[PDB]
């Protein structure tokens, strides 16, 4: 007997636990959300016939807790052999359980597979910074790579990179939109690549990138948004901004 519905499998992690290392002020310097895509969501209807869907979850960055991804997979797996009366019931339980875990109302949209037919694979906004003629040999984390990286003229720009890797490896693309002194692209790319051997949660990586850019580069406004490939059937896409609340859509990128 596979284990059936079990909300106790969900594991909260307080966001303050990692934010402590970032030495943040009393107020959070960002707002935003963690958007998750649940590619494996499946359960049984009343009559025992399997149902399959994709879930799209948004957890506020102000929630007391994030949800540990493994535990989230195990919790979703507990639906697989459980009978539910309706799709509405499934969506309601996901909101209830994930909101209890996070400590703040979590948004959930349970979508049938046909909602995805002809949907696009997308890239990120702005210019890709990856095509550089530089040598890298040190992959150890080094925030000081951002020392003096913003010395250009005042600009609004959006940059992105597909070279984010952190630690089993996690793989992501990251979009950085800002208004401030123009950022040195070589410094930025070396800084991003220095995560390659570093071990932090995706949500934390994004908050670290945001806070390092804010402290070294002092833009007037900033958004950092990363989209990671799935682990265990789930992906996370942390969005952190000085002024925006969320990305426009949750459209997948090429490796997602």
Site for ligand GUN in 226-245 (CB under 6 A): 236
Q: Is position 224 an interface residue for ligand GUN (rule: CB under 6 A)?
A: no
Q: Which is nearer to ligand GUN, 175 or 207 (CB)?
A: 207
Of the candidates 150, 152, 153, the one whose C-alpha atom is nearest the C-alpha of residue 218 is 150
Residue from 35, 37, 55, 190 binding Mg ion (CB under 5 A)? 37
The interface partner of residue 201, options being ligand GUN, its own copies, Mg ion, none and the CB cut-off 5 to 8 Å by kind, is ligand GUN
The interface partner of residue 37, options being ligand GUN, Mg ion, its own copies, none and the CB cut-off 5 to 8 Å by kind, is Mg ion
Residue from 69, 91, 173, 242 binding ligand GUN (CB under 6 A)? 69
How many residues of this chain interact with ligand GUN, rule: CB under 6 A? 9
Q: Is position 65 an interface residue for Mg ion (rule: CB under 5 A)?
A: no
Residues 7, 61: Cα–Cα separation, whole Å: 22
Q: Is position 173 an interface residue for ligand GUN (rule: CB under 6 A)?
A: no
Residues 174, 160: Cα–Cα separation, whole Å: 5
Nearest 10 degrees: CA dihedral of 121, 125, 127, 132?
-50
CA angle 65, 198, 244 (to 5 degrees): 50
Q: Interaction with its own copies in 42-101: which residues (CB under 8 A)?
A: 42, 44, 47-50, 52, 54, 77, 80-81
Nearest approach in angstroms of CB 68 to its own copies is 17
Instruction: Please name the residues in contact with 79: beta carbons below 8 A apart, sequence gap of 6 or more.
Output: 5, 41, 42, 43, 90
Residues 119, 253: Cα–Cα separation, whole Å: 11
Q: Interaction with its own copies in 99-158: which residues (CB under 8 A)?
A: 112-123, 125-127, 130, 132-137, 139, 154-158
The interface partner of residue 140, options being Mg ion, ligand GUN, its own copies, none and the CB cut-off 5 to 8 Å by kind, is none
Residues 173, 158: Cα–Cα separation, whole Å: 13
Structure tokens that stand for 180 in this block = 């401030």
Q: Is position 149 an interface residue for ligand GUN (rule: CB under 6 A)?
A: no
Q: Which is nearer to Mg ion, 111 or 185 (CB)?
A: 111
198, 142 in Cβ contact below 8 A?
no
């Amino acid at each position: 007997y596979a284990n059936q519905y079990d909300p106790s499998l969900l594991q909260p992690v307080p966001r303050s636990l990692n934010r402590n290392d970032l030495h943040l002020s009393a107020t959070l310097p960002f707002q935003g959300c963690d958007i998750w895509t649940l590619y494996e969501l499946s359960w049984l209807n009343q009559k025992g016939l399997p149902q399959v869907a994709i879930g799209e979850v948004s957890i506020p960055a102000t929630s007391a807790n994030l949800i540990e991804s493994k535990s989230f997979k195990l919790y979703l797996n507990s639906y697989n052999q459980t009978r539910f009366a309706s799709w509405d019931e499934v969506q309601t339980r996901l909101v209830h359980d994930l909101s209890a875990c996070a400590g703040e109302t979590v948004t959930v949209n349970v979508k049938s597979l046909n909602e995805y037919t002809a949907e696009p694979i997308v890239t990120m906004q702005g210019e890709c910074i990856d095509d550089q003629d530089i040598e890298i040999a040190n992959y150890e984390f080094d925030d000081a790579l951002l020392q003096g990286a913003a010395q250009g003229e005042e600009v609004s720009e959006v940059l992105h990179s597909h070279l984010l890797k952190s630690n089993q490896p996690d793989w992501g693309s990251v979009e950085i939109a800002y208004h401030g002194a123009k950022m040195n692209r070589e410094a930025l790319l070396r800084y991003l690549v220095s995560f390659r051997e570093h071990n932090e949660f995706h949500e934390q990586c994004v908050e670290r990138i945001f806070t390092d850019i804010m402290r070294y580069c002092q833009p007037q406004s900033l958004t950092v948004y990363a989209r990671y490939t799935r682990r265990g059937g789930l992906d996370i896409n942390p969005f952190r901004s000085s002024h925006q609340s969320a990305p426009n859509h949750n459209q997948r990128m090429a490796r997602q």
